[PDB]
Design a protein around this ligand. Structure first.
Ligand SMILES: O=C(O)[C@@H]1C[C@H](O)CN1
Ligand SMILES: O=C(O)[C@@H]1C[C@H](O)CN1
Lengths: 225, 225
């Protein structure tokens, strides 16, 4: 059974464009500057992934929210709030494994590299613009996992039918993030001054708005070999 | 009773800032180039306004969505979806009257000039940025009602505690861009290319992202003289 990777089960996706593929196959690659094999898997519904992984992602996201430096959330989410938020449409999990499927009951604290969601950034007439939010497991910090996450995203977002990518709020203090977007030729299409009240900064911090055409992506960024 | 105009009854507003006033008083002014008197009224809760006015605004917003040229919505809203959308936080109705309160059972088709909502544009850490959407009654096109609505907005948004204004999608084909926002020194802080699929346009239409500092507003724009 391959229902777990069928685009026909894409929920709450773009209204005007159908997926370009009937399915999305796991995408294997090596972490940058390493022999460590990682695999990205599509998530079209939570029922196809281990409960324990969902609960670990729930906690992972709350820690990120509590640091108060990256997401506009102030308070932690409930389990159902997180399910509604992260998995409203599409998501991806990236694990340290060479398996082409996700094994139950793994040690997520070591095996989960990162996750991201993809959804429409706007209501239906502008729903060909996707948004994405990312997370890296802090145990795997410093391995350039984010860069890899961004690449999987460029490979897969167009397959769901999206034509353009928008990040609404990349804080200028979030250097990890904007350097990746800069390096991958995401345009800075906007700048919100004093946008975020962030933990650890006494003054409000500016956010950059990133855009990228998903129909003309540079082949070298799609390649993870 | 003045509950209907107390900022203490403000639902779902900014998280870090309190309102700058205890109350919001009706703002009276004349339509530009005319001796017609208009009154702007605050709406903190729908219970304070007439059912027939709410029903008229519901159908008015659905007409605008059906035109398919200005909002990202594709389908008409249900009644409850309208309530949740337009009155999630704060709203304003601007009537052709010199009364300083809203009389029941008026002919809204002639008396209602315009309405707009005001709400946080983002989750709590960035909720000092407010968003607004406007509606002009079609029967009052060509009387510069939008410009006046925009002036009411500059007067009232900061009173609720917002510090910066963001419009996410002003399509380049919407004349409000140059008839209003450009003229009131809303900066164009971003541009989303091919943002929207709009009725009557074959090519997707670009959308301007407008921002404006609400703590430092040109006083000639605040003045309704
Ligand atoms: O900037 C964005 O839109 C994503 C979602 C979250 O707000 C952080 N990054
Ligand atoms: O651009 C905005 O965000 C407001 C809401 C609607 O999209 C029209 N103007």
């Amino acid at each position: 059974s391959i229902e777990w990777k069928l685009t026909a089960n894409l929920r709450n996706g773009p209204t005007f464009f159908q997926p370009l593929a009937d399915s999305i196959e796991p995408l294997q690659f090596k972490l940058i500057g390493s022999d460590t094999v990682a695999t990205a898997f599509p998530v079209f519904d939570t029922k196809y992934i281990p409960d324990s992984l969902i609960n670990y992602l729930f906690k992972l996201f709350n820690l990120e929210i509590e640091s108060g430096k990256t997401y506009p959330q102030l308070h932690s989410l409930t389990k159902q709030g997180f399910l509604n938020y992260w998995f409203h449409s599409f998501a991806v999990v990236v694990l340290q494994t060479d398996e082409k499927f996700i094994q139950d009951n793994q040690d997520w604290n070591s095996v989960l590299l990162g996750t991201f969601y993809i959804k429409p950034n706007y209501a239906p007439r502008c729903s060909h613009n996707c948004n994405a939010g990312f997370l890296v497991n802090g145990a795997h910090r410093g391995q350039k996992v984010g860069y890899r996450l961004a690449q999987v995203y460029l490979n897969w977002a167009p397959l769901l039918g999206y034509k353009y990518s928008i990040f609404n709020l990349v804080f200028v203090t979030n250097q990890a993030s904007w350097k990746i977007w800069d390096k991958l030729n995401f345009q800075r299409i906007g700048l919100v001054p004093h946008a975020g009240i962030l933990n650890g900064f006494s003054e409000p911090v500016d956010a950059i708005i990133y855009g990228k055409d998903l129909t003309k992506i540079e082949p070298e960024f799609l390649s993870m070999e």
